[PDB]
Write a protein that binds this ligand. Structure first.
Ligand SMILES: [Zn+2]
Ligand SMILES: [Zn+2]
Ligand SMILES: [Zn+2]
Length: 178
């Protein structure tokens, strides 16, 4: 197994996957690493198993169909993995915790949003459809663009949104387009 956390790239108290060489901090894995379960398989292994069981699940889909799916166990898992993929980028630190807004010439957003809040919402099964999760994720970056306006700090929102969007298209097998 790896000697660093797959998500945050630091050593510490790590839990090791039994089916691949990844390791995790307890609250870096999503969902949080399970108390018992020997063997234990991480979210990367669980996602690979879904595709292996149903190879046709990788054929191209329309985004509009994906968004309307109900959050059954497999879609819940895919959203947890997509959230994890955003936490795996170090620039996710800017969007993890509750923001505040006091900048000359800007007003804060109507509905603030952040990664930890989305993490809690997923854990408490508050989203009924994939659309709920995706809308909150996109809102994080949209609020950031709007608030920071012409400051070059707006680019962090662009960069982290690109990681989200790429991973969304991969995990949910969105039909490739020009
Ligand atoms: Zn970690
Ligand atoms: Zn694994
Ligand atoms: Zn199948």
């Amino acid at each position: 197994n790896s000697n660093i956390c797959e998500v945050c790239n630091k050593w510490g108290r790590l839990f090791c996957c039994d089916t691949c060489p990844r390791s995790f901090h307890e609250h870096c894995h999503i969902p949080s690493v399970e108390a018992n379960k020997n063997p234990w398989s991480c979210i990367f292994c669980r996602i690979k198993t879904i595709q292996e069981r149903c190879p046709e699940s990788q054929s191209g889909h329309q985004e509009s169909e994906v968004l309307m799916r109900q959050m059954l166990p497999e879609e819940q898992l895919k959203c947890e993995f997509l959230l994890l993929k955003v936490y795996c980028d170090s620039k996710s630190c800017f969007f993890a915790s509750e923001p505040y807004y006091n900048r000359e010439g800007s007003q804060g957003p109507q509905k603030p949003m952040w990664l930890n809040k989305v993490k809690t919402s997923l854990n408490e099964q508050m989203y009924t459809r994939v659309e709920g999760f995706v809308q909150d994720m996109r809102l994080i970056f949209h609020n950031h663009k709007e608030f920071y306006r012409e400051d070059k700090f707006t680019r962090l929102g662009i960069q982290v949104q690109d990681i989200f969007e790429k991973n969304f298209r991969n995990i949910f097998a969105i039909q490739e387009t020009s």
